[PDB]
Specification:
This protein is mostly beta strands. The protein has 4 helices and 24 strands. One of its GO terms (biological process) is proteolysis.
Length: 330
């Protein structure tokens, strides 16, 4: 089997991407944030505290003839941005782009933190990291990909995120028309539950490539590119007037600037992030200070190849017995 679904930016900045997902019988379609940095499929629901729902579409398990309460199971998750959610668990039929999993754990939110409430465009998350990170207790549950894997034509999914445009998540096949050149594959460590890999270095604009190992995670659920402070300083030093602002929370730059590109290495291959992809617009409405799309990871504990980096590539998440990641230009 295979599946193919379009993923759409939630706003003009590509702050996140939503993909429609069918849950239950008859189908209830929710727009979920596919997140290769976490491993829970959770949704706004008829159980979510009413004051914490503000425009999201909800899953109502009582209206699904295939929903079954997973007795005794609870979940609770905290994300790197400080947001959180928790609740109980149903199993139900879940389909993405024509690919169907029966018995998928659908984590129904009873509580969500303010940032989820305040984003009416995201109805929940669909985790695509390794199932060892799934938070369901006392019986950990599998991700949608893990449940689907055995049925897929090939045990892979691909992320093809658009810049200011829709893109595609495919399951079970590699669309050879969706990228240019060849796909370069690189090793993955699953020890932390992430799609964790080592980039071979970077360049800023037309500058020379610096060969240096940068361990980080391929994370579709993080907006920006978070890299070591040395790398980030080297990038922003090429932008007149750019500075790190403690009050804003990262590097800002004059909105009048033209940003240089940023290249990262995948083995001997190179992925080029155009400068425009690094512009996240005014820090507040009407400001001439703009927020940068490359930021320091120094306060995170891990480097994160988020959407800014991934949207410059066609990315293969290879879930073979020994997982690997593939990157191609496009």
């Amino acid at each position: 089997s295979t599946g193919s679904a379009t993923t759409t930016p939630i706003d003009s900045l590509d702050d996140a991407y939503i993909t429609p997902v069918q849950i239950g019988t008859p189908a209830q379609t929710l727009n979920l944030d596919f997140d290769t940095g976490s491993s829970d499929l959770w949704v706004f629901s008829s159980e979510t505290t009413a004051s914490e729902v503000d425009g999201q579409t909800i899953y109502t398990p009582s209206k699904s003839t295939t929903a079954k309460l997973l007795s005794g199971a609870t979940w609770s998750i905290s994300y790197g941005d400080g947001s959180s959610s928790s609740g109980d668990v149903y199993t139900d039929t879940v389909s993405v782009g024509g690919l169907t999993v029966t018995g998928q754990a659908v984590e129904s939110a009873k509580k969500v933190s303010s940032s989820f409430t305040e984003d009416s465009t995201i109805d929940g998350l669909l985790g695509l990291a390794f199932s060892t990170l799934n938070t369901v207790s006392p019986t950990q549950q599998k991700t949608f990909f893990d449940n689907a894997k055995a049925s897929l034509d090939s045990p892979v999914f691909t992320a093809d995120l658009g810049y200011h445009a829709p893109g595609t998540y495919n399951f079970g096949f590699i669309d050879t028309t969706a990228y240019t050149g060849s796909i370069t594959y690189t090793a993955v460590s699953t020890k932390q539950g992430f799609w964790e890999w080592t980039s071979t270095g970077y360049a800023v604009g037309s500058g020379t490539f610096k060969s240096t190992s940068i361990d980080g995670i391929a994370d579709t659920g993080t907006t920006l590119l978070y890299l070591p402070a040395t790398v980030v300083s080297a990038y922003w030093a090429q932008v007149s007037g750019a500075k790190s602002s403690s009050s804003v929370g990262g590097y800002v730059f004059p909105c009048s600037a033209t940003l240089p590109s940023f290249t990262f290495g995948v083995g001997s291959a190179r992925i080029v992030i155009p400068g425009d992809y690094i512009d996240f617009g005014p820090i507040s409405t009407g400001s001439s200070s703009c927020f940068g799309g490359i930021q320091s990871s120094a306060g995170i504990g891990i480097n994160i190849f988020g959407d800014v980096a991934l949207k410059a590539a066609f990315v293969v998440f290879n879930g073979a017995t020994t997982p690997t990641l593939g990157f191609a230009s496009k």
